[PDB]
Amino acid sequence: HVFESNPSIRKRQQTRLLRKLRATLDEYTTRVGQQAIVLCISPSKPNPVFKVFGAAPLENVVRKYKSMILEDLESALASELPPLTIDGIPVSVDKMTQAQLRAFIPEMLKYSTGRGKPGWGKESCKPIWWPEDIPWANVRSDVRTEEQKQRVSWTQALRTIVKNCYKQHGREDLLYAF
Amino acid sequence: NSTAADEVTAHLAAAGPVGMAAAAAVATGKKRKRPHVFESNPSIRKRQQTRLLRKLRATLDEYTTRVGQQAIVLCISPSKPNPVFKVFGAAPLENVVRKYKSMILEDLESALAENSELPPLTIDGIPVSVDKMTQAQLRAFIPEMLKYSTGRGKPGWGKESCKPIWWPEDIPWANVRSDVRTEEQKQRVSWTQALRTIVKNCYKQHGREDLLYAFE
DNA sequence: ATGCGCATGCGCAT
DNA sequence: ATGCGCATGCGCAT
Protein backbone atom coordinates (compact mmCIF):
# COMPACT_ATOMS: atom_id res chain seq x y z
CA HIS A 1 0.00 0.00 0.00
CA VAL A 2 0.82 3.70 -0.12
CA PHE A 3 0.12 6.64 2.16
CA GLU A 4 -3.07 8.37 1.00
CA SER A 5 -2.08 11.95 0.12
CA ASN A 6 -5.69 13.02 -0.44
CA PRO A 7 -7.16 13.78 3.02
CA SER A 8 -10.74 13.00 1.98
CA ILE A 9 -9.67 9.51 0.87
CA ARG A 10 -7.42 9.22 3.93
CA LYS A 11 -10.38 9.82 6.25
CA ARG A 12 -12.49 7.33 4.27
CA GLN A 13 -9.82 4.65 4.61
CA GLN A 14 -9.19 5.50 8.28
CA THR A 15 -12.89 5.01 9.05
CA ARG A 16 -13.04 1.76 7.08
CA LEU A 17 -9.83 0.30 8.52
CA LEU A 18 -10.41 1.43 12.12
CA ARG A 19 -13.82 -0.23 12.05
CA LYS A 20 -12.47 -3.39 10.49
CA LEU A 21 -9.85 -3.39 13.24
CA ARG A 22 -12.63 -3.18 15.85
CA ALA A 23 -14.56 -6.10 14.35
CA THR A 24 -11.48 -8.28 13.99
CA LEU A 25 -10.32 -7.46 17.51
CA ASP A 26 -13.77 -8.13 18.99
CA GLU A 27 -13.75 -11.52 17.27
CA TYR A 28 -10.24 -12.18 18.61
CA THR A 29 -10.95 -11.23 22.22
CA THR A 30 -14.22 -13.21 22.36
CA ARG A 31 -13.13 -16.37 20.54
CA VAL A 32 -9.62 -16.55 21.98
CA GLY A 33 -10.70 -15.22 25.37
CA GLN A 34 -7.71 -12.93 25.73
CA GLN A 35 -7.26 -9.32 26.82
CA ALA A 36 -6.17 -7.32 23.77
CA ILE A 37 -6.41 -3.70 22.60
CA VAL A 38 -5.62 -1.59 19.57
CA LEU A 39 -3.94 1.74 20.25
CA CYS A 40 -3.73 4.50 17.62
CA ILE A 41 -1.84 7.75 18.23
CA SER A 42 -1.18 11.04 16.52
CA PRO A 43 0.81 13.69 18.45
CA SER A 44 -0.78 16.46 16.37
CA LYS A 45 -1.15 19.76 18.21
CA PRO A 46 -2.93 20.93 20.26
CA ASN A 47 -4.69 17.69 21.29
CA PRO A 48 -2.96 14.41 20.40
CA VAL A 49 -5.36 11.57 19.65
CA PHE A 50 -4.78 8.58 21.96
CA LYS A 51 -7.43 6.08 20.82
CA VAL A 52 -7.69 2.74 22.66
CA PHE A 53 -10.24 0.01 22.06
CA GLY A 54 -10.56 -3.66 22.87
CA ALA A 55 -11.13 -5.79 25.96
CA ALA A 56 -12.12 -4.46 29.36
CA PRO A 57 -10.35 -3.78 31.67
CA LEU A 58 -7.21 -3.61 29.48
CA GLU A 59 -8.77 -0.73 27.54
CA ASN A 60 -9.10 1.54 30.61
CA VAL A 61 -5.75 0.39 32.00
CA VAL A 62 -3.87 1.45 28.84
CA ARG A 63 -5.77 4.79 28.77
CA LYS A 64 -4.15 5.77 32.08
CA TYR A 65 -0.75 5.71 30.30
CA LYS A 66 -1.68 8.33 27.69
CA SER A 67 0.66 11.06 28.95
CA MET A 68 3.68 8.78 29.44
CA ILE A 69 3.33 6.86 26.18
CA LEU A 70 2.85 10.15 24.31
CA GLU A 71 5.92 11.61 26.02
CA ASP A 72 8.08 8.57 25.27
CA LEU A 73 6.80 8.50 21.65
CA GLU A 74 7.72 12.08 20.70
CA SER A 75 11.16 11.06 21.92
CA ALA A 76 11.76 7.85 19.98
CA LEU A 77 10.91 9.97 16.95
CA ALA A 78 13.70 12.41 17.90
CA SER A 79 17.55 -5.24 0.75
CA GLU A 80 14.81 -5.26 3.43
CA LEU A 81 14.59 -8.39 5.57
CA PRO A 82 12.81 -9.15 8.85
CA PRO A 83 14.62 -8.56 12.13
CA LEU A 84 15.79 -11.68 13.94
CA THR A 85 12.94 -11.68 16.44
CA ILE A 86 10.31 -14.33 17.19
CA ASP A 87 7.14 -12.73 18.66
CA GLY A 88 8.82 -9.37 19.34
CA ILE A 89 11.82 -10.84 21.20
CA PRO A 90 15.28 -10.95 19.58
CA VAL A 91 16.78 -14.40 18.90
CA SER A 92 20.23 -15.36 17.70
CA VAL A 93 20.09 -17.35 14.49
CA ASP A 94 22.17 -19.74 16.60
CA LYS A 95 19.47 -19.46 19.32
CA MET A 96 16.51 -20.46 17.14
CA THR A 97 15.17 -23.99 17.34
CA GLN A 98 14.52 -26.05 14.23
CA ALA A 99 10.85 -25.26 14.76
CA GLN A 100 11.59 -21.53 14.88
CA LEU A 101 13.73 -21.81 11.73
CA ARG A 102 11.11 -23.76 9.78
CA ALA A 103 8.63 -20.94 10.53
CA PHE A 104 11.14 -18.07 10.04
CA ILE A 105 12.49 -19.15 6.64
CA PRO A 106 9.26 -18.87 4.56
CA GLU A 107 8.73 -15.35 5.93
CA MET A 108 12.36 -14.44 5.18
CA LEU A 109 11.86 -15.77 1.63
CA LYS A 110 8.89 -13.44 1.02
CA TYR A 111 11.06 -10.43 1.89
CA SER A 112 14.08 -11.72 -0.03
CA THR A 113 12.32 -12.63 -3.29
CA GLY A 114 9.14 -10.53 -3.19
CA ARG A 115 6.97 -13.61 -3.83
CA GLY A 116 4.01 -14.53 -1.64
CA LYS A 117 4.56 -18.18 -2.59
CA PRO A 118 8.12 -19.58 -2.82
CA GLY A 119 7.60 -22.07 -5.62
CA TRP A 120 9.42 -24.92 -3.88
CA GLY A 121 11.03 -27.38 -6.26
CA LYS A 122 10.94 -24.96 -9.24
CA GLU A 123 14.52 -23.94 -10.03
CA SER A 124 13.31 -20.68 -11.59
CA CYS A 125 12.19 -19.64 -8.08
CA LYS A 126 15.29 -20.69 -6.10
CA PRO A 127 17.17 -17.66 -4.65
CA ILE A 128 20.76 -17.12 -5.76
CA TRP A 129 21.96 -17.45 -2.15
CA TRP A 130 20.37 -20.86 -1.54
CA PRO A 131 23.05 -23.16 -0.01
CA GLU A 132 24.60 -25.51 -2.57
CA ASP A 133 24.32 -28.55 -0.28
CA ILE A 134 20.58 -28.21 0.40
CA PRO A 135 17.89 -29.18 -2.14
CA TRP A 136 15.54 -26.37 -3.14
CA ALA A 137 12.60 -27.97 -1.39
CA ASN A 138 10.07 -27.16 1.33
CA VAL A 139 11.98 -27.00 4.63
CA ARG A 140 8.93 -28.75 6.09
CA SER A 141 10.78 -32.06 5.67
CA ASP A 142 14.52 -32.66 5.27
CA VAL A 143 15.14 -34.29 1.87
CA ARG A 144 18.96 -34.30 1.91
CA THR A 145 20.92 -37.49 1.28
CA GLU A 146 21.65 -39.60 4.34
CA GLU A 147 25.36 -38.79 4.15
CA GLN A 148 24.59 -35.07 3.86
CA LYS A 149 22.64 -35.49 7.11
CA GLN A 150 25.72 -37.09 8.70
CA ARG A 151 27.88 -34.07 7.93
CA VAL A 152 25.39 -31.32 8.77
CA SER A 153 22.44 -31.53 11.14
CA TRP A 154 19.13 -30.26 9.79
CA THR A 155 19.07 -27.50 12.42
CA GLN A 156 22.53 -26.37 11.24
CA ALA A 157 21.51 -26.49 7.56
CA LEU A 158 18.44 -24.36 8.36
CA ARG A 159 20.67 -21.83 10.14
CA THR A 160 22.87 -21.77 7.01
CA ILE A 161 19.83 -20.94 4.84
CA VAL A 162 19.13 -17.90 7.04
CA LYS A 163 22.77 -16.80 7.33
CA ASN A 164 23.27 -17.03 3.52
CA CYS A 165 20.20 -14.90 2.89
CA TYR A 166 21.16 -12.08 5.27
CA LYS A 167 24.76 -12.01 4.05
CA GLN A 168 23.62 -12.02 0.40
CA HIS A 169 21.55 -8.91 1.13
CA GLY A 170 24.39 -7.39 3.14
CA ARG A 171 22.27 -7.37 6.29
CA GLU A 172 24.84 -8.59 8.82
CA ASP A 173 23.54 -5.70 10.99
CA LEU A 174 20.28 -7.64 11.45
CA LEU A 175 21.89 -11.08 11.63
CA TYR A 176 24.35 -10.05 14.37
CA ALA A 177 21.93 -7.57 15.99
CA PHE A 178 24.11 -4.43 15.91
CA ASN B 1 -17.60 -7.25 33.81
CA SER B 2 -20.22 -9.15 35.80
CA THR B 3 -18.97 -12.56 34.63
CA ALA B 4 -21.05 -15.01 36.71
CA ALA B 5 -24.13 -14.52 34.45
CA ASP B 6 -23.09 -17.08 31.80
CA GLU B 7 -21.85 -20.64 32.19
CA VAL B 8 -18.78 -20.40 29.94
CA THR B 9 -17.59 -17.11 31.45
CA ALA B 10 -18.46 -18.51 34.89
CA HIS B 11 -16.07 -21.44 34.48
CA LEU B 12 -13.43 -19.11 33.04
CA ALA B 13 -13.57 -16.62 35.93
CA ALA B 14 -13.18 -19.33 38.62
CA ALA B 15 -9.92 -20.62 37.13
CA GLY B 16 -7.79 -17.79 38.58
CA PRO B 17 -6.22 -14.61 37.19
CA VAL B 18 -5.61 -15.91 33.65
CA GLY B 19 -9.20 -17.17 33.58
CA MET B 20 -10.56 -13.93 35.01
CA ALA B 21 -8.75 -12.06 32.22
CA ALA B 22 -10.34 -14.42 29.71
CA ALA B 23 -13.80 -14.15 31.25
CA ALA B 24 -13.66 -10.35 31.24
CA ALA B 25 -12.55 -10.40 27.59
CA VAL B 26 -15.42 -12.65 26.47
CA ALA B 27 -17.86 -10.56 28.52
CA THR B 28 -16.77 -7.34 26.80
CA GLY B 29 -18.10 -8.78 23.54
CA LYS B 30 -21.36 -10.01 25.06
CA LYS B 31 -22.16 -6.37 25.81
CA ARG B 32 -21.87 -5.40 22.12
CA LYS B 33 -24.15 -8.34 21.14
CA ARG B 34 -21.42 -9.48 18.68
CA PRO B 35 -22.05 -12.88 17.02
CA HIS B 36 -19.02 -14.89 18.15
CA VAL B 37 -18.48 -17.15 21.20
CA PHE B 38 -15.46 -18.46 23.09
CA GLU B 39 -13.69 -21.53 21.73
CA SER B 40 -13.22 -24.22 24.39
CA ASN B 41 -11.25 -26.57 22.12
CA PRO B 42 -7.63 -25.38 22.61
CA SER B 43 -6.52 -26.69 19.22
CA ILE B 44 -9.27 -24.81 17.38
CA ARG B 45 -8.70 -21.77 19.61
CA LYS B 46 -4.98 -21.78 18.79
CA ARG B 47 -5.86 -21.98 15.09
CA GLN B 48 -8.30 -19.08 15.34
CA GLN B 49 -5.77 -17.05 17.37
CA THR B 50 -3.23 -17.58 14.56
CA ARG B 51 -5.61 -16.70 11.73
CA LEU B 52 -6.96 -13.69 13.62
CA LEU B 53 -3.59 -12.31 14.69
CA ARG B 54 -2.49 -12.54 11.05
CA LYS B 55 -5.53 -10.54 9.95
CA LEU B 56 -4.91 -7.92 12.66
CA ARG B 57 -1.23 -7.56 11.71
CA ALA B 58 -2.24 -7.08 8.09
CA THR B 59 -4.92 -4.51 8.88
CA LEU B 60 -2.59 -2.64 11.26
CA ASP B 61 0.03 -2.57 8.47
CA GLU B 62 -2.40 -1.16 5.92
CA TYR B 63 -3.74 1.35 8.46
CA THR B 64 -0.31 2.56 9.51
CA THR B 65 0.79 2.87 5.87
CA ARG B 66 -2.29 4.44 4.33
CA VAL B 67 -3.35 6.68 7.23
CA GLY B 68 0.23 7.49 8.26
CA GLN B 69 -0.53 6.92 11.94
CA GLN B 70 1.28 4.91 14.62
CA ALA B 71 -0.83 1.94 15.76
CA ILE B 72 -0.24 -1.26 17.72
CA VAL B 73 -2.12 -4.27 18.98
CA LEU B 74 -1.27 -5.41 22.51
CA CYS B 75 -2.27 -8.87 23.78
CA ILE B 76 -1.77 -9.97 27.37
CA SER B 77 -2.22 -13.17 29.38
CA PRO B 78 -1.30 -12.70 33.08
CA SER B 79 0.17 -16.18 33.41
CA LYS B 80 2.93 -17.37 35.70
CA PRO B 81 5.82 -17.52 35.77
CA ASN B 82 6.05 -16.19 32.21
CA PRO B 83 3.22 -13.82 31.19
CA VAL B 84 2.17 -13.32 27.58
CA PHE B 85 2.78 -9.68 26.58
CA LYS B 86 2.93 -9.40 22.79
CA VAL B 87 2.97 -6.00 21.06
CA PHE B 88 2.98 -5.63 17.31
CA GLY B 89 2.46 -2.83 14.80
CA ALA B 90 4.10 0.48 13.88
CA ALA B 91 7.59 1.39 15.04
CA PRO B 92 8.63 3.08 17.26
CA LEU B 93 5.29 2.83 19.16
CA GLU B 94 5.79 -0.94 19.32
CA ASN B 95 8.93 -0.52 21.43
CA VAL B 96 7.56 2.34 23.54
CA VAL B 97 4.66 0.15 24.70
CA ARG B 98 6.91 -2.88 25.34
CA LYS B 99 8.78 -0.96 28.07
CA TYR B 100 5.61 -0.82 30.21
CA LYS B 101 5.07 -4.60 30.40
CA SER B 102 5.89 -4.35 34.12
CA MET B 103 3.38 -1.63 34.98
CA ILE B 104 0.60 -2.67 32.60
CA LEU B 105 0.70 -6.24 33.91
CA GLU B 106 0.41 -5.15 37.54
CA ASP B 107 -2.34 -2.67 36.59
CA LEU B 108 -4.32 -5.32 34.74
CA GLU B 109 -3.97 -7.68 37.71
CA SER B 110 -5.30 -5.07 40.16
CA ALA B 111 -8.33 -4.26 38.00
CA LEU B 112 -9.14 -7.96 37.80
CA ALA B 113 -9.10 -8.49 41.60
CA GLU B 114 -12.67 -7.10 41.52
CA ASN B 115 -10.90 -28.53 48.30
CA SER B 116 -9.17 -31.08 46.05
CA GLU B 117 -5.99 -33.10 46.43
CA LEU B 118 -5.68 -32.97 42.61
CA PRO B 119 -5.02 -29.79 40.59
CA PRO B 120 -7.40 -28.35 37.99
CA LEU B 121 -6.78 -29.23 34.36
CA THR B 122 -5.69 -26.08 32.50
CA ILE B 123 -3.58 -25.07 29.53
CA ASP B 124 -1.68 -21.97 30.70
CA GLY B 125 -4.43 -21.15 33.19
CA ILE B 126 -7.41 -21.79 30.86
CA PRO B 127 -9.62 -24.78 31.82
CA VAL B 128 -9.40 -27.71 29.39
CA SER B 129 -11.05 -31.11 29.14
CA VAL B 130 -8.82 -34.20 29.35
CA ASP B 131 -10.19 -35.36 25.97
CA LYS B 132 -9.00 -32.08 24.38
CA MET B 133 -5.44 -32.05 25.72
CA THR B 134 -2.64 -32.77 23.23
CA GLN B 135 -0.26 -35.66 23.75
CA ALA B 136 2.51 -33.23 24.79
CA GLN B 137 0.24 -31.64 27.39
CA LEU B 138 -0.89 -35.00 28.81
CA ARG B 139 2.69 -36.27 28.95
CA ALA B 140 3.89 -33.13 30.74
CA PHE B 141 0.88 -33.12 33.10
CA ILE B 142 1.27 -36.70 34.36
CA PRO B 143 4.42 -36.20 36.52
CA GLU B 144 2.88 -33.09 38.13
CA MET B 145 -0.36 -35.00 38.76
CA LEU B 146 1.69 -37.77 40.43
CA LYS B 147 3.28 -35.30 42.88
CA TYR B 148 -0.21 -34.15 43.92
CA SER B 149 -1.66 -37.66 43.96
CA THR B 150 1.07 -39.44 45.95
CA GLY B 151 2.72 -36.52 47.76
CA ARG B 152 6.13 -37.67 46.47
CA GLY B 153 8.59 -35.30 44.84
CA LYS B 154 9.99 -38.20 42.81
CA PRO B 155 7.62 -40.85 41.41
CA GLY B 156 9.94 -43.89 41.54
CA TRP B 157 9.25 -44.96 37.96
CA GLY B 158 9.55 -48.74 37.59
CA LYS B 159 9.69 -49.38 41.34
CA GLU B 160 6.66 -51.58 41.94
CA SER B 161 6.57 -50.32 45.52
CA CYS B 162 5.73 -46.88 44.05
CA LYS B 163 3.17 -47.90 41.41
CA PRO B 164 -0.13 -46.10 42.11
CA ILE B 165 -3.13 -48.26 42.98
CA TRP B 166 -5.08 -46.70 40.09
CA TRP B 167 -2.32 -47.24 37.48
CA PRO B 168 -3.83 -48.71 34.29
CA GLU B 169 -3.09 -52.41 34.01
CA ASP B 170 -2.23 -52.28 30.27
CA ILE B 171 0.47 -49.59 30.68
CA PRO B 172 3.94 -50.25 32.12
CA TRP B 173 4.71 -48.41 35.34
CA ALA B 174 7.43 -46.45 33.53
CA ASN B 175 8.36 -42.85 32.68
CA VAL B 176 5.81 -41.49 30.16
CA ARG B 177 8.82 -39.73 28.58
CA SER B 178 9.07 -42.74 26.17
CA ASP B 179 6.31 -45.25 25.37
CA VAL B 180 7.66 -48.69 26.37
CA ARG B 181 4.47 -50.65 25.72
CA THR B 182 4.71 -53.74 23.55
CA GLU B 183 3.79 -53.49 19.88
CA GLU B 184 0.52 -55.33 20.48
CA GLN B 185 -0.34 -52.94 23.32
CA LYS B 186 0.53 -50.04 20.99
CA GLN B 187 -1.79 -51.35 18.27
CA ARG B 188 -4.67 -51.78 20.73
CA VAL B 189 -4.48 -48.31 22.41
CA SER B 190 -2.97 -45.11 21.01
CA TRP B 191 -0.35 -43.40 23.17
CA THR B 192 -2.64 -40.40 23.58
CA GLN B 193 -5.50 -42.64 24.79
CA ALA B 194 -3.18 -44.46 27.22
CA LEU B 195 -2.08 -41.11 28.65
CA ARG B 196 -5.71 -39.97 28.96
CA THR B 197 -6.43 -43.23 30.81
CA ILE B 198 -3.60 -42.55 33.25
CA VAL B 199 -5.12 -39.15 34.07
CA LYS B 200 -8.74 -40.35 34.13
CA ASN B 201 -7.89 -43.26 36.43
CA CYS B 202 -6.15 -40.94 38.87
CA TYR B 203 -9.05 -38.47 39.04
CA LYS B 204 -11.58 -41.32 39.30
CA GLN B 205 -9.67 -42.82 42.26
CA HIS B 206 -9.62 -39.48 44.09
CA GLY B 207 -13.39 -38.99 43.59
CA ARG B 208 -12.79 -35.83 41.53
CA GLU B 209 -13.84 -36.96 38.06
CA ASP B 210 -15.76 -33.67 37.76
CA LEU B 211 -12.42 -31.91 37.18
CA LEU B 212 -11.92 -33.81 33.91
CA TYR B 213 -14.47 -32.36 31.47
CA ALA B 214 -14.25 -28.55 31.20
CA PHE B 215 -16.84 -27.20 28.71
CA GLU B 216 -18.01 -30.79 27.94
C1' DA C 1 16.67 -40.45 38.62
C1' DT C 2 13.52 -37.77 35.91
C1' DG C 3 11.09 -34.25 33.19
C1' DC C 4 12.05 -30.03 30.16
C1' DG C 5 12.11 -29.04 25.81
C1' DC C 6 14.35 -29.80 21.16
C1' DA C 7 14.23 -32.76 16.74
C1' DT C 8 11.81 -33.83 13.05
C1' DG C 9 8.35 -36.22 10.49
C1' DC C 10 4.16 -35.50 8.57
C1' DG C 11 -1.10 -34.76 8.70
C1' DC C 12 -3.85 -31.56 6.79
C1' DA C 13 -5.99 -26.92 6.28
C1' DT C 14 -4.82 -23.56 3.49
C1' DA D 1 0.86 -25.48 -3.35
C1' DT D 2 2.55 -24.55 1.39
C1' DG D 3 3.51 -23.74 6.34
C1' DC D 4 1.08 -24.51 11.05
C1' DG D 5 1.21 -27.37 14.75
C1' DC D 6 0.45 -32.20 16.64
C1' DA D 7 2.83 -36.89 17.46
C1' DT D 8 6.37 -39.06 20.08
C1' DG D 9 11.40 -40.23 20.50
C1' DC D 10 15.19 -38.83 23.01
C1' DG D 11 19.18 -35.58 24.39
C1' DC D 12 20.63 -33.95 28.41
C1' DA D 13 20.42 -31.14 32.54
C1' DT D 14 19.17 -32.12 37.03
Residue numbers in the entry:
A (entry chain B): 95 to 172, 183 to 282
B (entry chain A): 60 to 173, 182 to 283
Quoted passage from the original study:
Nuclear respiratory factor 1 (NRF1) regulates the expression of genes that are vital for mitochondrial biogenesis, respiration, and various other cellular processes. NRF1 was initially identified as a transcription activator of cytochrome c by binding to the cytochrome c promoter as a homodimer. Subsequently, a consensus sequence GCGCNTGCGC (N represents any nucleotide) was identified as the DNA binding motif of NRF1 (6), which has also been detected in the promoters of many other nuclear genes relevant to mitochondrial biogenesis and respiration, such as the promoters of reductase (ubiquinone-binding protein) complex (6), cytochrome oxidase assembly factor COX17 (7), myocyte enhancer factor 2A (MEF2A), and ferridoxin reductase (FDXR). Our structural, mutagenesis and luciferase reporter assay results revealed that, although the NRF1 DBD alone is capable of recognizing the TGCGC DNA motif, the cooperativity between DD and DBD is essential for the binding of the intact GCGCATGCGC sequence and the transcriptional activity of NRF1.
To investigate the molecular mechanisms underlying the selective binding of NRF1 to the GCGCATGCGC DNA sequence, we determined the crystal structure of NRF1 (aa 54–284) with a 14pb ATGCGCATGCGCAT dsDNA. The DBD is composed of three helices α5 to α7 and two short 310-helix, and each DBD possesses positively charged surfaces to recognize two neighboring major grooves of the DNA duplex from nearly opposite side. Interestingly, in the NRF1 dimer-dsDNA complex, although the DD or DBD from the two monomers superimposes very well (with RMSDs of 0.33Å and 0.34Å, respectively), the arrangement of these two domains differs in both monomers. When binds with DNAs, only one NRF1 monomer adopts a structural conformation that is close to the AlphaFold2 predicted model, and the DBD and DD of the other NRF1 monomer adopts a U-turn conformation, resulting in the two DBDs of the NRF1 homodimer bind to the consensus sequence GCGCNTGCGC from nearly the opposite side of the DNA duplex. Hence, residues R206, N242, and R244 of NRF1 DBD are critical in sequence-specific binding to the GCGCATGCGC motif.
